[PDB]
Design a protein around this nucleic acid. Structure first.
Lengths: 96, 169
RNA sequence: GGUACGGCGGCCAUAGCGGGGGGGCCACACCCGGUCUCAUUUCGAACCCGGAAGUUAAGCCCCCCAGCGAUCCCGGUUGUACUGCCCUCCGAGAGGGGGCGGGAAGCCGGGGACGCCGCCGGCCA
RNA sequence: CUCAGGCGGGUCAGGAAUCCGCCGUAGAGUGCAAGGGCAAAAGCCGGCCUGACUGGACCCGUAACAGAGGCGGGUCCAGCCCCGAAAGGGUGGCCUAGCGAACCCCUGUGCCUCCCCGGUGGGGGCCAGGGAUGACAGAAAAGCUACCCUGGGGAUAACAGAGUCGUCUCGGGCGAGAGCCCAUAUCGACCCCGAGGCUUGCUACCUCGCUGUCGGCUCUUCCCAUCCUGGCCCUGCAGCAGGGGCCAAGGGUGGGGGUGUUCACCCAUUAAAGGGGAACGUGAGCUGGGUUUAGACCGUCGUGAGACAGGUCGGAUGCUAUCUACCGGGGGUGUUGGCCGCCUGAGGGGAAGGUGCCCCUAGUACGAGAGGAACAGGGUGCCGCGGCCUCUGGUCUACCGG
RNA sequence: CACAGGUCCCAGCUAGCCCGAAAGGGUUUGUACUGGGGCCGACGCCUGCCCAGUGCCGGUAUGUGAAGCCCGGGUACAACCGGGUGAAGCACCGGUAAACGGCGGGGGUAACUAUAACCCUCUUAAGGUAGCGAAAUUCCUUGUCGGUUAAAUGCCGACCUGCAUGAAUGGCGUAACGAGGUCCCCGCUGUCCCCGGCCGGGGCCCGGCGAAACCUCUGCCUGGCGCGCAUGCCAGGGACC
RNA sequence: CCGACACAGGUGCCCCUGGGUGAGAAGCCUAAGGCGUGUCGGGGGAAACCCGGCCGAGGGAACUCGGCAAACUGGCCCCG
RNA sequence: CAGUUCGCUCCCGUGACCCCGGGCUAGGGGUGAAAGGCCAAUCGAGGCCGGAGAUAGCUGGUUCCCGCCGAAUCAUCCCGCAGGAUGGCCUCCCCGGAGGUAGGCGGUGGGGUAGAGCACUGAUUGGAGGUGCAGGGGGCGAAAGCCCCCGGCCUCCUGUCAAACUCCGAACCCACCGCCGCCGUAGAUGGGGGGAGUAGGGUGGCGGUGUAAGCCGUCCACCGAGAGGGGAACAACCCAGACCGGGGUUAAGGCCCCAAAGUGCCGGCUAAGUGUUACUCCAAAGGGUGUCCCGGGCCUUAGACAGGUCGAGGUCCGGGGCCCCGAAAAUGGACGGGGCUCAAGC
RNA sequence: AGGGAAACCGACAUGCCCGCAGCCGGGCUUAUGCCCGGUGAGGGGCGGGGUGCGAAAGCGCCCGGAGUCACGGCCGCGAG
RNA sequence: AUAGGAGGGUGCGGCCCGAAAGGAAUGAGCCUCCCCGAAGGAAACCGCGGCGACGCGGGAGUACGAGGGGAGGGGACCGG
């Protein structure tokens, strides 16, 4: 039986937190800041449901090209297409 | 009863979750300890498989009855402890097939089996020195009922392999 | 610069749970009393307001431990289980094997671990 | 503010009504499946509210890479607001389901427009919301065909072949036992390992510009897992017989009743009246009883046309042999010149033989008795094969007679 | 299939039924002992119950019911909106089964054994009456019993458990009749045991006329590979034309 | 004449029939009339086999789906 | 002889009988003692010409040569499933002008598969301790309740599990950055335009499913669309990817003959023609003082075993190599064949 | 000269940056050639402008002149 | 008239034809001798290693080697 892709399809383990990490995350990731041109990894925080990108892009590394409101604008290369995502800084991690 | 060669091999994934398997049958073997477990015994004879294999509950029960009868006749109830270390968890199913063949062929449960790795103990008989031959004969009788090559080993209380010492002595 | 003083924090158990001993210049508390501010789906029990008669019993501060939990290092199991690539290698089959590259989990033994760090203020000097 | 559950203590009050204390990482709850997330909350209890609003931009998913109508979601700007001391939050439900093109119609709102011009009634257009297509990327919509027709398909069933062996047929390993003792004279539970392709099934690999079905008759050949005939072993084998097994495929394995039957059942004989393969051998050899068209009847089902792997009566079998194959009959060349006659036998073929009964051994061996053999020696029947016409019978379109 | 016979339906004539676009017409130079339309099918004895359903016929108090007409609103006139009247047809009521069809299902008994319907409970419009029944209808089935044979998946007689018989889509019986299906008996015979002779015409040879179907080229086997049954491929065997 | 034919069909057997046997316009023989043109001839123990016909000892349906085919009987007179 | 005839047999043969000449009924029509029969060899809707060269997603066919490049049967939608459309993959031309990334090393991050384990969720054998715990069974008491057994619930020990479990956790894969390597100004990455074909795939490894064959996906290696040299012939297996004429050396593999190359060498095994098989084809459970070896115990050279006497190794066990039994099929026959035994087998 | 359903309204003959080819100056190189710096048509990006929706911001389309005709070829659609 | 494969492919031999259009008496097939030479590449013999098949150093990158040139003899074929 074919199943169409949805936001939470096959995310039982991808979007699950460690038992010892249950609860609110430390505020450093919430309040972290980035500059245009910086490269950041995408690590979705399951507890925060705002500004979450599609889980298909979890684990990828993109580049910051702007900032709208509280969310950062991240550009990724899916195959040959350029895809633009609006990701909250809590879901991002600096490279190196 | 279909031939055991069908379920002998372990190429299929584990099928044990009773929460999701519909119509799983109840076990046919309910006794796993016989004799005098409390009493101590100098020697223990264990039976191992030479290859991974699924042993059916019917074969397990047949071996249990044969070995228990032999040990009761020859050794005595208070002079031995016979234990089967494995439990049948794998659920064996069969394609239910006027009549449609190969259409919706997922099988319905028909039996149970125990899946064993290589060199895994199946059963143990704990006896003293004077009943070692009877224990070995019981182990051979049990092995005659299983669908795989099996071998016996003798261990002391500490767990060291002393089969050659005992048989030579 | 000293202090068994406090406030705001970072990592978020190697930091937790449970035990033993010591301490109060200051400071933090327990504590005393409910007119006023505030509240009980009753209760000044909490919260709030007004204070210093008494206490270091405990919250707190300092030192220690290894019973539980967690976790770092070393040795054994062990280059064991598993695995990427190639193969005119064996095997009736199941599967295994040779060469090159990786490599556990659990268990046993011996150590570690009863947190580390940032900004500032109070008191004394 | 902290839940579920548990422990200890309490008037009725008990397992369970309400209350005090302690342990209590969520073992509760969050509207509804499951997964994920939630503990000074996203749970429970209260206060105040309607941001479940208006005008727009960009981006992700359905639909990766890699195209998309419709739909869902995320990040924001502005307007008017809500809660809060403030920070901050609010574009429905903590996240992932609960839904839908064109055309047409209804409603809201405030603009444009209708053929020379102006007014009125009416119509058309732009924006927003709604009425549904579940076959859910959106036709309005019941059946028979055996009187059937066309284009095709081994992309796809029935017969047959192929693969497989679950099933079928036939074995093997161990030995609980049953056999007066004794597992193995015989039967052998529960389990386990196989062989064959002789039953059925499964797959759909060859064959739909046709490979003619079941049964029977005729004819040829092969296998052994041997029914009889030949020779043996064990026995719970006294004899006569039985039970089990081994070698052995030369020969035999027949006649009849019902039934289309194969098979199965039955009858009288017999040494026995074996199982199978050869395109379920054999329709350019036969027959056509069954099956499977077109006609018709009965029963059941259907409103009906009609249908039934339900019965029943009738219902077509084409051939001048091209090649090869086998059976017999001839002409040639070669065999180091031609011809006549008599021989040799390398190889091939055979079943040229097979099998009953009777006399005697002998009422003997054996056996309590009943009963009852064998070696050797004689006779003869049947089946099979190769010949012949003296005898018998048939024919005798020569001939003779009525 | 038809048939004589039985029975049902419509119609008093400008009828009933039918052809046609119409005009006209067939039945009809006819008139209920007639014309037209179904079903059964000689003859003998009979033809039971059911009108809830689907049809047909009669009624239609009452509801709905199109156009037209009327009334009010609207439109300087209309389109448009509301109401009243409202035939047929449906709704409703009654007849009709030789109209289409239907005619069920559980417990226990009368134990002078056991087993039967007298019997009491749901249930419909009613629950299959007389007959016939293993049937051209019976799946189990080659039902069971009796006769026929040495032997009977046949045939005949009987029982009833009628999967799924039945009374004009007729039930049962029936003399005579039949190139209909079916079983048996006497007689007869080459159907057979078991085949053997004879005759005429072909076949065969000689002299003549003189084609067609069909044809990739070819054309020996065993075991194999192969689109899974090869004269042609591989390894072997054999073979003068 | 029609059927593509000097076609064993159909149209047309549409109308008519001496003697004997015999109920008979039956079968058989024969007179009249017609023909040897229902048009390829010759050979032969010259086979096997096929088509058409005759006979078959003993048995008498044992054959077969099924007495298929063949065979038995047969006209007339008198009893019944 | 005949696009329905001939022979034998059979049926009616005064009647609803057979035949002839003249007429009428014409195609959704006629006629029918009803078979869907008959209507000029045609009838479940006649024939002739016309619409008309009708239509089909279905079958067949499509005509000269060389040169260059060279696929696909995978996703979404369709009354869509033998057919189409949008993409993916191919090819041709042009613009633009400096980067690009199939391979590797190091780094920054992500993951929960294999394995493993019981710390949640659910299974799972026995024992010990605690708890009267709303259970049941007895004894026991007027009645308030006791005494045991069993059962339930916790802790520990013991023996086992999970595709829809995870306190742990690889190999490996992916995203990004620097470098090595390679490609690119003889113009890459990228962009625009023209033309397609492809919507049946197969073998092979892996995963789910199934007794198996097979069915369904996945990996892109080979056939499809691929020559040459081999496996006896073979689509897929091995070497190998190919313009033309010559010379040489190697690859797969092979060297007794067929058949080019050794009856080649050293050590050991097999006595069954086992074998002579890399794979497309190849029989097991259970047994063997059959042989060649390894390891471990008891006695152990006149103190062992076999039958107080002899007078040198025996006793047992667990394993390894080859071989043997288990082992029956149909036309006559298959190591490719001949044949091969200190091999021409292993 | 485009925007809009319509009424209707109504735009850069270059303000700025980057920059290939070409040109200019310099260095190395036997030469080709390479490198550095300017200028740079075409090309790319800003800024500004017309109009539609909007209270506005802001977005869509358009704006700094290349089209038209002919011959030949490939393809799509309709006709057999 | 003792031999097996879709009727063909590579090479040559036997028999036969061979005037012209192809070469050729300005010399053909053929015979003898000399020079250079890519990739490749021996052996006699001597010394040594190995149980052996055999190998290693010299001989030696020698003899030979696709092809590229020259000279002499003979006198009619070669290609097809």
């Amino acid at each position: 039986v074919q199943k169409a892709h949805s936001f939470r399809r096959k995310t039982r383990k991808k979007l699950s937190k460690h038992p010892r990490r249950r609860g609110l995350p430390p505020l450093t990731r919430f309040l972290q800041e980035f500059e245009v041109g910086q490269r950041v990894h995408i690590v979705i925080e399951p507890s925060y449901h705002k500004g979450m990108p599609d889980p298909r892009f979890h684990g990828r590394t993109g580049t910051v090209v702007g900032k709208r409101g509280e969310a950062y604008i991240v550009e990724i290369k899916d195959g040959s297409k350029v895809k633009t995502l609006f990701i909250h800084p809590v879901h991002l991690r600096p490279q190196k | 009863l279909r031939p055991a060669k069908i379920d002998r091999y372990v190429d299929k994934p584990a099928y044990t979750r009773r929460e999701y398997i519909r119509g799983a049958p109840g076990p046919k073997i309910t006794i796993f300890d016989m004799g005098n477990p409390a009493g101590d015994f100098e020697f223990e004879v264990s039976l191992h498989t030479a290859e991974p294999v699924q042993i059916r509950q019917n074969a397990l029960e047949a071996a249990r009855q044969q070995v228990n009868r032999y040990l009761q006749k020859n050794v005595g109830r208070s002079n031995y402890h016979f234990k089967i270390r494995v439990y049948p968890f794998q659920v064996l199913r069969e394609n239910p097939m006027y009549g449609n063949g190969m259409r919706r062929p997922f099988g319905k449960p028909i039996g149970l089996a125990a899946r064993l790795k290589k060199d895994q103990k199946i059963l143990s008989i704990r006896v003293n020195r004077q009943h070692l031959k009877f224990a070995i004969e019981g182990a051979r009788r049990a092995a005659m009922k299983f669908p795989c090559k099996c071998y016996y080993r003798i261990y002391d209380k500490e767990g060291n392999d002393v089969t050659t010492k005992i048989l030579s002595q």
